Paper text:
Carotenoid cleavage dioxygenases (CCDs) are non-heme FeII enzymes that catalyze the oxidative cleavage of alkene bonds in carotenoids, stilbenoids, and related compounds. pmcCarotenoid cleavage dioxygenases (CCDs) are a broadly distributed superfamily of enzymes that catalyze the reaction of dioxygen (O2) with carotenoids, stilbenoids, and related redox-active polyenes. These enzymes use a mononuclear non-heme FeII center to activate O2 for reaction with a specific alkene group in the substrate, generating carbonyl-containing products of importance in biological processes such as hormonal signaling and light detection. Unlike many mononuclear non-heme iron dioxygenases that coordinate their FeII centers using a 2-His, 1-Glu/Asp “facial triad” motif, CCDs use a 4-His cluster, three of which hydrogen bond to second-sphere carboxylates (Glu/Asp). While one coordination position is occupied by a solvent ligand as demonstrated by several crystallographic and spectroscopic investigations, the other is vacant because of apparent occlusion by a nearby methyl group of a semiconserved, second sphere residue (i.e., Thr/Val/Ile), making CCDs five-coordinate (5C) in their resting FeII states.
To investigate whether reduction in side-chain volume would allow solvent binding at the sixth position, site-directed mutagenesis was used to introduce a [name] substitution in [name], thereby opening the maximal potential space for ligand coordination. Crystallography on the [name] FeII–[name] piceatannol complex showed a piceatannol binding conformation in [name] FeII–[name] resembling that observed for the wildtype enzyme, the main difference being a ∼10° rotation of the β-ring toward the vacancy left from the absent Thr side chain. Two solvent molecules remained bound to the iron center trans to His197 and His313. Notably the iron-solvent bond lengths were shortened by ∼0.4 to 0.5 Å in the ES complex as compared with the resting [name] FeII–[name] structure. However, the resolution of the diffraction data was insufficient to allow modeling of the mixture of 5C and 6C species found by MCD spectroscopy. The energies and intensity patterns of these four transitions are consistent with one 6C and one 5C species, constituting ∼85% and ∼15% of the sample, respectively, as estimated by comparison of the intensities at 11,500 cm-1. These data indicate that substrate binding leads to dissociation of one iron-bound water in a subset of the molecules in the sample. We find that while the resting FeII site in the less constrained [name] [name] variant is 6C, substrate binding induces loss of a water ligand in a fraction of sample, which appears to confer higher binding affinity for NO.
Residue numbers in the entry:
A (entry chain A), B (entry chain D): 30 to 526
The structure:
Amino acid sequence: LPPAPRYFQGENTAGFMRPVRFEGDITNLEVVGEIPKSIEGTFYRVMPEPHLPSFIPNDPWFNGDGNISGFYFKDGHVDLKQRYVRTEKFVREAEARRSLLGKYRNRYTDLVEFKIRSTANGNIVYWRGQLLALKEDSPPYAMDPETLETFGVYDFDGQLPSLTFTAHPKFDPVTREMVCFGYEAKGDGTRDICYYSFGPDGKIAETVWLVSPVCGMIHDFAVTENFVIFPIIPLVCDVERMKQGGDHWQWDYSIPMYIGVLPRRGAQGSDVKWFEAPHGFAGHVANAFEDDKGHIQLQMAYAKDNVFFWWPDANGKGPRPGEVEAHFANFVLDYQSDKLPLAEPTYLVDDDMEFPRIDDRVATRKHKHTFFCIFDRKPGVTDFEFVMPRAGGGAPMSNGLAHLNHETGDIQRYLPGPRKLTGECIFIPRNSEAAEGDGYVMVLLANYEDMCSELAVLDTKDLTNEVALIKLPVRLRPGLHGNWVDKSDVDGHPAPL
Amino acid sequence: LPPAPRYFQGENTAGFMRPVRFEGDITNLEVVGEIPKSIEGTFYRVMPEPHLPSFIPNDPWFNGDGNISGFYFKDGHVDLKQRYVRTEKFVREAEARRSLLGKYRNRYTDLVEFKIRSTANGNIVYWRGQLLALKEDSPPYAMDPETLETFGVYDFDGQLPSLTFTAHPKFDPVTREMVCFGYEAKGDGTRDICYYSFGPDGKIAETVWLVSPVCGMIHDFAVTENFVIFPIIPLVCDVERMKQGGDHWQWDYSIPMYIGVLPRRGAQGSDVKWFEAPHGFAGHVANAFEDDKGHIQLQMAYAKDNVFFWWPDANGKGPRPGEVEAHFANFVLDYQSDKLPLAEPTYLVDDDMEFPRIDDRVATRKHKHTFFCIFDRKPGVTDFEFVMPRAGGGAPMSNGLAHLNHETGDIQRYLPGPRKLTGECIFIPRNSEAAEGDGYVMVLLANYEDMCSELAVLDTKDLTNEVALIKLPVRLRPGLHGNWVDKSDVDGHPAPL
Ligand SMILES: Oc1cc(O)cc(/C=C/c2ccc(O)c(O)c2)c1
Ligand SMILES: Oc1cc(O)cc(/C=C/c2ccc(O)c(O)c2)c1
Ligand SMILES: Oc1cc(O)cc(/C=C/c2ccc(O)c(O)c2)c1
Ligand SMILES: Oc1cc(O)cc(/C=C/c2ccc(O)c(O)c2)c1
Ligand SMILES: Oc1cc(O)cc(/C=C/c2ccc(O)c(O)c2)c1
Ligand SMILES: [Fe+2]
Ligand SMILES: [Fe+2]
């Protein structure tokens, strides 16, 4: 076998990116300021965190074993519980005490044959009394919300029709449906997309098989009252390249950014329309909704080049680190239109941004508040001379949050400080009567001065001010998505506005 | 109640002394170099680590909740398990989410009435299939060696005759007895010492009640073939002072360092002889043995002033931090002598030292190897300008280990580096046939550059060289005692030479 390294090496595991790999508990976290006593619930987040050194050099951040953090809040006190998802990969590698899974989404490089290759490191959502740890090449892994025990691969009582389940299902706050899809839904290199949904009772509702024009990456999607929308990143998969040891994904500069639109209920596969947006990178969706005219307003991060620059085109053409900005775009789509090309989007703000969140009580409907990460290159905002030697590589950087009020156009910006960076935020309604976007924002900070993590609590009345700063004595490696599960919500999801 | 702080403040919890308070697992620790594959067993150590901020300002290091680390070795791989002892204090404070126990060994300052005030933070030893977490004001807490679960207060099947059990029992390698005592054995301020022992079958053997000349601190003791030996630190307890909120301990410059000698088997309390060594501080015992003449050679750390300077005399007189050195002393005692005053000891080395270990296969018998912590003020050995601002306070500092060969007088010194300090080492026999003092030494390092801990593995053939350096991504706060439990030893203790 290729030798197994016994310590981590390379920039992707240096500095603040160095794996800690702890599982367990830290109760009664230290708090500067005061956590509002009325906050009750749990912030779950997932980070990629390799449990064992990879035999693949410069293994991407996206390929690390998913480790779940839960921050449990009650009466102004907070406890941390942390545990790895017991994926097939995690368990077999733990047994062997060495890495066995190879390159990202390339089974031809694995040292053993895996049935499930999930690292379960994309998202951690709540559904019908379980956590689901998501990874878009795999079914979910189900976990216990209280103990973070892994139950195992979850197939929705034998109903799951797809080999793959998106990291970005949407929760309809009115119907209480979980709306889902998977791409490469019949395995490596397949252009099959399976669109499917589950009612609040756990029974499958929709199942529609459609066909993508290319085998392209569909990381996120959007859901409106009457439509589902599939933006395709121009990363394309060729299995013959993979069999020779090559990358799953390769940029294609010659294609549009396809945006498929399908009727949400009762459709056939042939009902999809593949609109063609200008070439670019489909980032995370804030939210989509139908306006008065029945037109889809799709609000999402959008870049004009390959954000995932480590997967360039066939000739190695692509951007350098830190070069590509994504902007908060609005696309207008009309399902009734026969014109496939779409105009350039309008932009809601100037900021280099990503990881947009809304008040999910209006998900799939018109929203007027968005919270998002920003990266401001303006001199002084980040002390790069101090931070970059301590940062490692392989993960995106955010040096603030912004709150856009879409009606007034007012923006507030939270800057944690020149030697701190942020992850994706969560929004918490102040209470069950709170107006849209009124409540608390929490975000995990990397503090490069202390080389510790912190959890900031902000009030939406003034996003510039920390109400509380929870001071962890360990590092939580930069992670991906996370979710709030409020104690007042019996099914784990907030009530509609 | 006095207010409960919600974050740690003061020098005793600053820098590397800041509590982490993690419990759980980190498997497959990163390793630089190579752990000898034949090493099989577990290194257990205990640190004081306050679970909650104290309502007592500048609470001493000795008053922190005991947290147990286990480093489990097999086939050159190592896993960490970490868990707090579930003392009465730990559990009640966890339930309340605030500190309730008050000043060190002063129940009159507690916010609730405790039955057992143990922090179980002094030592962690193996006995008849359990760990015993020791604290000299209390009985032991029994724990599971594999899971570190706490079973509860341990009273040896109802046989424990004393309220108190020393942090420093001795294991006789020939008889397989655990030889024990407790001072203040009938409660606060009592001069009762209870000497007791347990045979390898768990049955109590000796129980002898004796009377100390003063109510002084007897932190450690020594055992030979035919005698047990009780050195008294001139810290003295007055319960009336304690009832007014004063300190348990107060130095007395007017008394000798008493050294009691009692026949090991069949004695009455009146058989003790209280020899009178020159005034000074009784540090940790390396080992004691009887020579050819039947005279006791007692080898221990010994200082000429109050090492515990935060407990000065009645008029507040005593040394400053970093002023008092302890030296490796040899005292000669003759039980048959009627002369009580003892000569000044001879000194085996000149180093400022503490935390001596021997090859416990010759415990209670003549030894010719000692391993110990040293603090060398020689320019450059420690980079104080870098270290001291990051160090915090309240704990002793060691910047190397030394190995003394008592026959040849040769000393080897291990220096981890200018920005690292050490804890107490353990010795591991190379194998069951190894000569005395031949095998491995392990020691936990504080790395102030990384603000991480590391576990160094040394071969006694050359103590200056690390064969392996195990790199923890967290800090383990400076701790006290620890022990090796070898897999090849059925009763957890090594076979006699
Ligand atoms: O030694 C082996 C051989 C093998 O062929 C499979 C396994 C483990 C399978 C597994 C363990 C945990 C999971 O969560 C999961 O999806 C799969 C272990
Ligand atoms: O900074 C960004 C921006 C973005 O729009 C998407 C991502 C992550 C996508 C992803 C893609 C494949 C994976 O396997 C995975 O875990 C995550 C990260
Ligand atoms: O009056 C009370 C009230 C209470 O809420 C708890 C206790 C004691 C609990 C305890 C828990 C664990 C231990 O190991 C132990 O010795 C004691 C006593
Ligand atoms: O650096 C030193 C030198 C020494 O000779 C003894 C000690 C520790 C003694 C101790 C005394 C009382 C306690 O309650 C406790 O946990 C520990 C520490
Ligand atoms: O006359 C003295 C007395 C003393 O106590 C220390 C020094 C110098 C210390 C030193 C010099 C160089 C270093 O790199 C370093 O860590 C420490 C000089
Ligand atoms: Fe995502
Ligand atoms: Fe001790």
